[PDB]
Design a protein around this ligand. Structure first.
Ligand SMILES: Nc1ncnc2c1ncn2[C@@H]1O[C@H](COP(=O)(O)OP(=O)(O)OP(=O)(O)O)[C@@H](O)[C@H]1O
Ligand SMILES: Nc1ncnc2c1ncn2[C@@H]1O[C@H](COP(=O)(O)OP(=O)(O)O)[C@@H](O)[C@H]1O
Ligand SMILES: Nc1ncnc2c1ncn2[C@@H]1O[C@H](COP(=O)(O)OP(=O)(O)O)[C@@H](O)[C@H]1O
Ligand SMILES: Nc1ncnc2c1ncn2[C@@H]1O[C@H](COP(=O)(O)OP(=O)(O)O)[C@@H](O)[C@H]1O
Ligand SMILES: [Mg+2]
Ligand SMILES: [Mg+2]
Lengths: 1443, 134, 320
């Protein structure tokens, strides 16, 4: 086959020669994988062409197909794919270099009529076609022999052990049909009814006395014999011959043609006058559905639609019998129905390729959940379905789908089953619905199903037991609570009947087994009062040894540290009993209630009990995307890429090392249940036990492969996934407070002559009687980000143990009383900061008082500022962002933050904006040489890729695979500034919050391309957030917030803020010692102005009226800067300068003229109250350093003349925009100049269109020498071009030292990714996403050579990147231009946290009457206009806007 | 000199830049799909260097001949215009009203009833207007 | 009373075929509500006009490329093009369809959209002829339309099936009273029931027709398959019991009677006799109660609300 492509064959020969040389060199004493893959990806078209020879190759992957062709002589590689290709065949039996037979998945052996001689020159598909034909011939021969023997009066009980089940089934059906027709030729049915009843009794006795294969055969035959008895009894009870013929018309009749010489089409099936052909395909011994009226009417609808060559369609609620009814129809028609699980990942190409595969094979393809496809995909495949329909109708040999004329088999049929009426499910279009014949399957016959199932299983009172079970289920569904996960339908009944099978050997075949199976299935899913309801109704309907597994559970619990309470043991026994037969389990409860402890303890106990090793994978579902969880197709190459769950299942099924043969596999989905995610595994969860993939692969679920679903709620979870899995419900917590403290203390001890004494002293000081009172008293406080007191115990125990163990050196120099005193004081501190540590200062003081009054007065008293023991700034120092004024609250917050960070505990800092969370974090970790800080500022649209890019330059990937910081000494701290802002999805899940919870709990994550688990080694996570009551804040998951210590940060008081800011004003006023005594009134005036502005201008007026101590810091910095670069100051000039800076910092965001006048009168009141001056209006305070060498108040006329001549030069040089000069544009120029002369000085210009925002930014940037960069973003311009221009601007700004002004219009933000990039750029000094991979190395070497050319001694990448971000912070200014503030994207731009906190907002607004009059009067005075007499009208003063 | 461009077609940037360089009258259809590359053309913000007028479109400068006029056309009422375009264009609405409806129905009625009379009336009206202008 | 205006004043009516034939436009669009499809009408029109109908649904870029190529081929070598579900390719409709319509004699292009779906572009909509497809509200008109689209027992069974289909499709409009939910029976149901009737008549050549079998299969499989309510299943079963009772004389409605065929006529004679009966039938003013076997007070509320809505909209239109 190599001669078809000569160049490819030569390349393959060269690669094989290189591999042989490498192997010889290795045996004498990377590139091979790349060379293999570079030709394997070129073999995709070869494999696709190979799939058309044997059409069942569409059910195999490219790797499996490559193995199929590669096995040219072994022929045993083909035997392990028979379940994928055929469905009912497990392996091929080989003997005497031939195909002796095949083995079904149930273990049944089908011996061929003749052996298939296997030659070395025969291809795999060449003998597979022969095997596929010979299987059908063998099934027909077995049927013919069985029917010929049964027609000779031979009893069926001696030919059960001779032929296969399909043969016995078809022969019995044909005999029954002809004998009932003979009975219809007369009016007698009693003799045949008695004969069938005696046959049923004899088959039941033989079932009692047979082996496993004969037992399966008889169990499957009893279904059809009970159906035969039911039909014969129904015909016997008919009164009229016409009525009997009417009843016989609507059942499946089985006939055999006597004249046709073609053997494989000699048997046809008649129902309601329509004939369908038997296919004689091997089905094995499948599970047979009980014949019900719903089943028979569905069979009639399918027969009608297939007579017209239409598609079959079943609709109805979940768990009714649609998929299994289609499969049973195919089984009765002698073929295996291929079952697909439709999904939104199944696009038009995937659906059409599946249609090509099934139309080439001739198989019956059932597409379950067809309404889960997209509406566009549903509409698109309608032409393909109509083409298959018309080709089947007219007998076309070929159909044309997907640009290829493929053959069309006449045996094909398309079936769909859907469940309308649920959320997230599309509606089929009408042109598609007219291609199918729908049938409602709303209400199955559960009583009949249970009766015949119990009769086959051998229960003594099957009818009465079935009536009791169905009545009990309906009664439970009536009188239990009306919450969404209670379902007691057909799937619950099937689970109950399946648990009856292994319980008979210990409880007897009867009511005791039924009751115990009902308690095994239904009880763990019930609540508190529903359990009593279940017990009472079970006792009133029905009449009425696990020591080894209890001991194993106790051994696992006391090896893992847990304590066996009654509730924990009950939950463990319930989980252990449910996992025995139910392969999929859901554990639902509160956050931190004991789900993980329960399932870990049970699987450890089962490992101890059985000796089977447990392989556990915990996958957090919503952290990963769906195409990374299951997989995706590369459209450029048509190559499938495995998802994480797909790769895990494929590794388990392949089992290269053989370790999965004698092991139990647990896959835990530890996230909230998204129906979009989990309904793609519906075929996995139900009786199909297959994972249907878009590329046609079919991965079976082994019996030792169990799926766990750990979640906290079931609000969005559909019944389609609730019914398929057993549900374990956690009504309360499985642990008590004292037991949780004991377990946490033991866990902390295990992580560490005085050790036993310390353990005993701590356990004695942890007095539960005194503890439970403050535990139940702490619930009366108000706790921000409310975490339960059950979940704060981890923080309390970890903090207490860490604080005690940190003083181990000084524990050998004090007596027992002082040791107990200091230990109990540390215990009080830990209890305070764990229980009331997320409350206000008053609540913290009250909790201190309650702790002291409830631990007794004899112990050491914990105070407000209790601690254990063994400012003058500078004028240039007020501009440092890392300087903090030491107060008692700041010292206390830094101390508790450092203690909790050293305690290896997650920390969440909650508080209002500007309170000082980032400040105290940076001040606590600036003095520490053991920690490094990386700052990540979240937006409303943050991804885990942003976090990983922020972790790129600080961490290392070493191989198992762990993520550890580059520095081998200092640890890393993840600061997340806004963990409340990332948005929920349409089902209410925060991807970033779940990722952070994953990192905090399991100390790692999964890599999405390569599906490898990464380990977090020395990376801490510190969260910052605003209160959820604030707008735009989303409540975080309790599962995430229970893993972190929450500390509430508060605004400093008026006196505290004063005492902070007189020190700043003193450091400013060291430059002016002649006014040194005015620091107290200037600081009081500033703090009072901030308090008054915060009180007056609130969110209720407008949304951006947000004030903080950051405004006071801005005022201090601006006052210092203007004093420093200005001339000698007097008292009047100092007060006017403070008023000017107060204007530009507090009231440039004000919109109303009334609000601006109120701020003017506020400045007047504050100055008169604190600093006892001319006019201090916005137009009367013209401070600018443009007219001189220093920043000073300038004359209005001289300022106007300077702006006139500079703007004439600007228009003559760069861009001619002939405007006119007015005072509003002048002071806008001054404030834009003030912002653009700053460091990290960003502007957000907000005003009406054609007001002058962009041209004033350009003019001021030209005045300051800045480089104006306006991005050339247009239609069909995307994130790639935006990142290109942003990276170019950043690179020029840093490397070339180009001072750059960046003007960003509202129109440039096409989508919110643009806004996210700008948030990253302004919160940080760069974007980590732009510089990664090879770009990071290019940036690093460019920085190295630039810094070496600049003569600076920087070598390490930390120093080079610090120089990089410092250069961007120095030389980049960003100005935002917003025309309509009421748009949605403009509102997202304004309410953005980084853009709000970093920019200086200048609400220019629209022109007022004075500005319009000035502009008009200044550009109509140049024309000859006063050429006539004019009489001055007498009008009102309010009607005149001019002079 | 009239060229007919559309915002939804390819080669639009090159054709419009060539038309600006030549000095030809441009009518751009589909005005509700405005491409912001010609923002300088909309705002008439040009750079003057001696006797030459230059405008920057996209990533390179082209020259303005001085005889170039730009028209933007849209046949979609209640469409979508960006505020930058809307504040800077002379939006003129060409909608039919009852007077035009009556005039066109009367013209069709006259054509279908007496075509010679309608032709003679139109010729007489045109001759009278030409005589008044003369 | 509502139909009196259009009966007395307007003396003409236009269907889809008349709109297509009597218009100087090569572009047509068809709108309808959900669960109603009118592409079989276009298939019938293309069959009657000796044309070739190409049916291309719009859901994916491959279908869009195929639609572009087929439109380009049709503009040169004729043929009819139907674009199903154009609202699921709205960007393509806004760009390519707009460009093509803005800029052969036997070329016609049809677009199928939804009345309650997404908004179509106004310049595209105003340049194409617009029709709304819906079922005929009259019962007798429905029987006449079903009869005009077609041994003696096949003719009789087709007549009875046309009557039954018209009655059930008229009963579906009375949502609270005629049924319990809203159901949609269409030409697929009519075709499947007709195929079943022909199969029964072919397999029973002794002229002993299994009327109970016909009733149960039509009530449970062909028409009761969509039905998920037992009360509505009983409604369909009772209608089948009235229509397909197989008696010597059948009074399908209180007005007229349908005698069974004799043994001395031909298929053309039977067709002419049934057409004469259909012509001699007069639909009364209380047809929704007399012909559907429903109480008058049930349909009086529905008729009064319909007339009140129509007359109130007319009054509001006239007041401006
Ligand atoms: N029987 C027990 N004895 C002692 N400690 C227990 C017991 N059951 C649970 N715990 C403790 O309860 C704490 C709660 O964590 P756990 O893993 O049980 O929560 P969960 O139910 O998985 O919650 P989440 O919703 O966060 O996944 C753990 O620290 C665990 O050690
Ligand atoms: N006639 C029947 N006899 C016995 N068991 C049945 C019958 N119909 C359905 N079942 C059982 O009920 C369950 C129905 O699940 P399934 O049909 O897969 O759900 P869906 O209808 O949503 O596809 C199956 O486990 C099947 O074994
Ligand atoms: N001792 C202090 N206590 C409180 N605030 C202070 C102190 N010293 C300075 N500040 C000012 O308080 C502001 C804190 O804001 P920041 O820490 O950015 O808030 P957040 O952490 O919520 O983003 C800083 O601008 C800082 O100048
Ligand atoms: N003081 C003024 N005198 C004359 N024209 C002005 C004045 N201010 C603004 N304009 C007009 O408004 C427009 C402002 O455009 P520009 O500043 O570039 O962006 P924006 O539309 O965002 O303000 C100019 O074209 C100019 O004609
Ligand atoms: Mg299903
Ligand atoms: Mg902040």
């Amino acid at each position: 086959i190599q001669n078809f492509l000569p160049l490819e064959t030569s390349k393959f020969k060269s690669l094989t020669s290189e591999y042989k040389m490498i192997t010889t060199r290795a045996f004498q004493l990377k590139l091979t994988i790349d060379s293999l893959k570079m030709i394997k990806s070129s073999l995709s078209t070869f494999l696709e062409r190979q799939r058309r020879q044997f059409p069942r190759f569409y059910f195999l992957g490219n790797d499996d197909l490559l193995k199929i062709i590669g096995s040219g002589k072994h022929h045993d590689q083909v035997s392990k794919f028979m379940k994928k290709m055929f469905g009912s065949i497990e392996s091929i039996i080989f003997f005497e270099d031939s195909i002796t037979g095949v083995r079904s998945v149930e273990g049944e052996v089908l011996n061929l009529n003749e052996k298939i001689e296997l030659k070395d020159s025969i291809q795999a598909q060449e003998w597979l076609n022969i095997l596929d034909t010979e299987i059908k011939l063998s099934v027909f021969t077995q049927f013919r022999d069985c029917l010929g023997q049964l027609k000779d009066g031979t009893d069926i009980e001696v030919v059960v052990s001779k032929y296969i089940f399909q043969a016995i089934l078809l022969s019995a059906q044909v005999m029954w049909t002809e004998l009932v027709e003979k009975c219809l030729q007369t009016n007698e049915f009693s003799k045949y009814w008695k004969e069938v009843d005696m046959k049923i009794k004899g088959l039941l006795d033989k079932l009692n006395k047979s082996s496993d294969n004969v037992k399966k055969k008889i169990e499957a035959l009893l279904v059809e014999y009970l159906h035969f008895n039911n039909v014969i009894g129904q015909l016997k009870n008919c009164s009229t011959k016409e009525e009997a013929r009417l009843l016989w018309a609507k059942v499946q009749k089985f006939y055999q043609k006597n004249d046709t010489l073609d053997d494989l089409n000699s048997v046809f099936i008649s129902q309601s006058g329509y004939l369908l052909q038997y296919k004689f395909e091997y089905i094995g011994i499948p599970e047979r559905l009980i014949y019900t009226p719903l089943l028979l009417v569905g069979f009639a609808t399918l027969t009608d639609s297939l007579h017209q060559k239409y598609g079959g369609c079943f609709f109805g609620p979940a768990g009714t019998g649609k998929t299994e009814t289609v499969k049973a129809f195919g089984q009765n028609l002698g073929r295996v129905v291929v079952v697909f699980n439709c999904d939104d990942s199944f696009d038009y190409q995937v659906l059409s390729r599946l249609l090509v595969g099934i139309t080439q094979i001739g198989a019956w393809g059932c597409f379950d959940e067809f309404n889960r496809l997209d509406e566009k995909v549903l509409s698109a495949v309608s032409a393909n379905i109509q083409q298959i329909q018309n080709g089947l109708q007219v007998g076309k040999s070929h159909i044309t789908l997907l640009e290829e004329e493929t053959p069309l088999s006449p045996h094909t049929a398309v079936f769909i089953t859907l469940n309308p009426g649920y959320n997230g499910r599309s509606e089929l279009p009408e042109n598609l619905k007219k291609s199918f014949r729908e049938f409602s399957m709303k209400s199955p016959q559960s009583g009949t199903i249970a009766e015949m199932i119990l009769q086959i299983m051998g229960f003594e009172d099957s009818k009465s037991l079935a009536s009791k079970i169905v009545h009990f289920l309906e009664l439970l569904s009536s009188k239990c609570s009306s919450m969404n996960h209670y379902h007691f339908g057909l799937r619950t009944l099937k689970g109950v009947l399946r648990n009856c099978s292994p319980l008979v050997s210990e409880f007897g075949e009867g009511e005791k087994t039924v009751v115990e199976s009902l308690k095994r299935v239904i009880l763990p899913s019930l609540g508190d009062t529903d359990e009593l309801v279940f017990k009472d109704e079970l006792s009133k309907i029905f009449d009425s040894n696990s020591k080894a597994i209890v001991q194993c559970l106790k051994d696992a619990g006391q090896r893992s540290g847990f304590s066996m309470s009654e509730e924990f043991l009950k939950k463990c026994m319930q989980f252990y009993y449910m996992q025995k037969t139910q392969q999929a389990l859901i554990l639902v409860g509160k956050a931190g209630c004991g789900k993980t402890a329960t399932w870990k303890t049970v699987i450890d106990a089962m490992a101890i009990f059985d000796g089977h090793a447990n392989v556990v994978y915990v996958i957090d579902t919503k952290v990963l995307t769906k195409e990374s969880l299951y997989g995706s197709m590369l459209k450029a190459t048509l190559e499938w890429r495995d998802g994480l769950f797909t790769s895990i299942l494929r590794r388990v099924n392949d089992d290269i090392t053989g370790t999965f043969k004698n092991s139990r596999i647990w896959v835990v989905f530890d996230s909230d249940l998204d129906p979009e995610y989990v309904e793609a595994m519906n075929s996995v969860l139900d009786d199909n036990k297959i994972l249907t993939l878009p590329n046609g692969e079919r991965l079976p679920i082994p019996p030792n492969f169990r799926i766990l679903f750990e979640t906290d709620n079931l609000d969005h979870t559909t019944p389609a996934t609730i019914t398929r899995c057993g549900l374990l419900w956690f009504s309360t917590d499985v642990c008590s407070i004292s037991s949780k403290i004991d377990h946490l203390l033991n866990k902390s001890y295990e992580a560490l002559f005085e050790l036993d004494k310390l353990k005993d002293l701590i356990s004695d000081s942890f007095d539960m009687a005194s503890l439970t009172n403050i535990f139940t008293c702490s619930n009366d406080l108000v706790h921000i980000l409310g975490v339960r007191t059950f979940n704060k115990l981890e923080t309390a125990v970890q903090l207490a143990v860490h604080l005690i163990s940190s003083y181990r050196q000084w524990f050998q120099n004090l007596d027992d009383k002082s040791l107990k005193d200091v230990i109990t004081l540390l215990i009080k501190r830990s209890l305070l900061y764990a229980l009331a540590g997320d409350s206000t200062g008053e609540s913290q003081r009250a909790f201190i008082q309650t702790i002291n009054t409830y631990f007794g007065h004899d112990s050491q008293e914990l105070s407000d500022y209790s601690t254990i023991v063994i400012v003058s700034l500078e004028a240039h120092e007020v501009m440092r962002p890392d300087i903090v004024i030491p107060t008692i609250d700041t010292i206390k917050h830094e101390k508790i933050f450092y203690d909790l960070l050293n305690s290896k505990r997650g920390i969440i800092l909650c508080g209002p904006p500007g309170s000082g969370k980032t400040m105290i974090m940076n001040n606590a970790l600036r003095n520490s040489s053991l920690y490094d800080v990386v700052g990540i500022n979240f937006s409303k649209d943050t991804t885990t890729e942003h976090i990983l890019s922020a972790l790129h330059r600080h961490t290392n990937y070493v191989t198992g695979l762990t993520l550890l910081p580059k520095s081998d000494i200092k640890n890393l701290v993840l600061f997340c500034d806004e963990i409340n802002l990332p948005k929920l999805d349409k089902y209410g899940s925060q991807n970033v919050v779940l990722f952070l919870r994953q990192l905090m709990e399991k100390q790692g994550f999964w890599k999405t391309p390569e599906n490898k688990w990464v380990t977090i080694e020395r990376i801490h996570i510190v969260g910052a957030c605003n209160p959820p009551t604030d707008p735009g804040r989303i409540p975080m998951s309790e599962r995430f917030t229970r893993h972190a210590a929450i500390l509430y940060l508060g605004y400093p008081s008026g006196k505290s803020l004063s005492q902070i800011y007189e020190i700043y004003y003193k450091a400013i006023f060291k430059l002016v010692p002649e006014f040194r005594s005015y620091t107290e009134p200037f600081a009081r005036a500033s703090v009072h102005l901030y308090n008054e502005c915060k009180a007056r201008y609130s969110t209720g007026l407008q949304s951006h009226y947000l004030f903080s101590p950051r405004e006071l810091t801005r005022l201090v910095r601006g006052v210092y800067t203007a004093i420093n670069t200005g001339p000698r100051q007097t008292l009047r000039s100092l007060i006017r300068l403070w008023a000017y800076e107060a204007w530009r910092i507090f009231a440039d965001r004000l919109v109303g003229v009334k609000e601006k006048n109120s701020f003017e009168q506020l400045l007047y009141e504050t100055v008169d109250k604190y600093l006892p001056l001319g006019n201090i209006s916005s137009t009367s305070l013209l401070f600018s350093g443009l007219l001189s060498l220093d920043f000073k108040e300038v004359n209005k006329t001289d300022l106007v003349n300077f702006i006139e001549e500079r703007f004439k030069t600007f228009c003559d040089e760069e861009l001619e925009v002939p405007m006119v000069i007015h005072e509003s544009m002048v002071d806008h120029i001054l404030r834009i100049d003030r912002a653009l002369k700053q460091v990290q000085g960003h502007m957000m210009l907000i005003g009406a269109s054609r007001t002058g925002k962009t041209i004033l930014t350009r003019f001021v940037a030209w005045l300051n020498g800045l480089k104006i960069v306006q991005p050339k973003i247009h239609r069909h311009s995307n994130l790639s071009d935006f990142d290109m221009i942003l990276k170019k601007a950043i690179s020029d700004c840093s490397l070339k030292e180009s001072r750059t002004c960046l003007i960003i219009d509202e129109s440039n933000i096409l989508e919110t990714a643009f806004l996210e990039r700008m948030n990253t750029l302004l919160a940080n000094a760069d974007i980590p996403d732009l510089f990664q991979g090879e770009e990071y190395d290019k940036l690093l070497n460019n920085l190295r050579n630039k810094t070496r050319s600049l003569g600076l001694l920087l070598d390490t990448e930390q120093e080079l990147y610090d120089w990089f971000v410092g250069e961007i912070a120095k030389n980049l200014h960003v100005v935002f231009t917003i025309c309509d503030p009421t748009n949605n994207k403009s509102s997202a731009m304004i309410s953005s946290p980084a853009l709000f906190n970093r920019c200086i907002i200048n609400w220019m607004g629209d022109w007022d009457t004075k500005t319009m009059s000035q502009v008009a009067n200044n550009m109509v005075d140049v024309v000859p206009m006063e050429f006539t007499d004019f009489i001055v009208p007498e009008v009102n003063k309010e009607l005149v806007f001019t002079e | 000199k009239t060229v007919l461009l559309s915002f939804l077609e390819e080669g639009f940037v090159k054709r419009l830049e060539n038309a600006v360089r030549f000095g030809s009258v441009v009518i751009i259809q589909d005005g509700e799909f405005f491409d912001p590359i010609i923002s300088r053309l909309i705002s008439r913000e040009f750079n003057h260097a001696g006797n030459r007028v230059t405008v920057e479109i996209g990533d390179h400068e082209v020259d303005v001949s001085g005889d170039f006029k730009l028209f933007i056309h849209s046949c979609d009422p209640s469409g979508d215009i960006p505020i930058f375009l809307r504040s800077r264009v002379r939006l003129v609405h060409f909608v039919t009203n009852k007077e035009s409806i009556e005039t066109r129905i009367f013209d069709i009625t006259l054509t279908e009833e007496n075509a010679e009379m309608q032709r003679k009336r139109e010729d007489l009206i045109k001759l009278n207007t030409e005589y008044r202008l003369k | 009373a509502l139909n009196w205006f259009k009966n007395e004043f307007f003396v003409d009516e236009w269907n889809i075929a008349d709109v297509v034939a009597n218009s100087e436009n090569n572009y047509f669009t068809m709108a309808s509500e959900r669960d109603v499809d009118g592409t079989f009408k276009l298939i019938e029109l293309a069959k009657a006009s000796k044309e070739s109908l190409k049916i291309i649904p719009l859901g994916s870029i491959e279908n869009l490329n195929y639609a572009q190529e087929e439109i380009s081929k049709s503009k040169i070598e004729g043929g009819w093009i139907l674009l199903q579900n154009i609202q699921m390719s709205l960007s393509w409709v806004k760009t390519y369809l707009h460009k093509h319509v803005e800029e052969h004699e036997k070329f016609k292009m049809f677009m199928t959209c939804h009345l309650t779906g997404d908004k179509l572009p106004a310049p595209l909509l105003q340049r194409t002829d617009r029709v709304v497809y819906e079922d005929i509200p009259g019962i007798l008109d429905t029987v006449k339309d079903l009869w005009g689209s077609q041994g003696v027992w096949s003719v009789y069974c087709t007549f009875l099936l046309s009557w039954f289909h018209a009655l059930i499709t008229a009963r579906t409009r009375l949502v609270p009273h005629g049924f319990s939910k809203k159901y949609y029976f269409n030409d697929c149901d009519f075709q499947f029931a007709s195929v079943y009737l022909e199969n029964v008549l072919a397999t029973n050549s002794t002229n002993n027709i299994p009327w109970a079998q016909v009733r149960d299969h039509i009530a449970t499989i062909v028409y009761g398959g969509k039905i998920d309510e037992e009360k509505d299943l009983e409604v369909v079963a009772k209608l089948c019991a009235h229509v397909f009772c197989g008696s010597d004389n059948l009074q399908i409605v209180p007005g007229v009677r349908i005698p069974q065929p004799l043994l001395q006529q031909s298929e053309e004679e039977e067709r002419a006799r049934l057409t004469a009966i259909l012509s001699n039938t007069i639909e009364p003013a209380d047809s929704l109660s007399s012909w559907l076997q429903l109480p008058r007070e049930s349909i009086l509320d529905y008729e009064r609300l319909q007339a009140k809505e129509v007359a109130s909209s007319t009054e509001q239109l006239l007041q401006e």
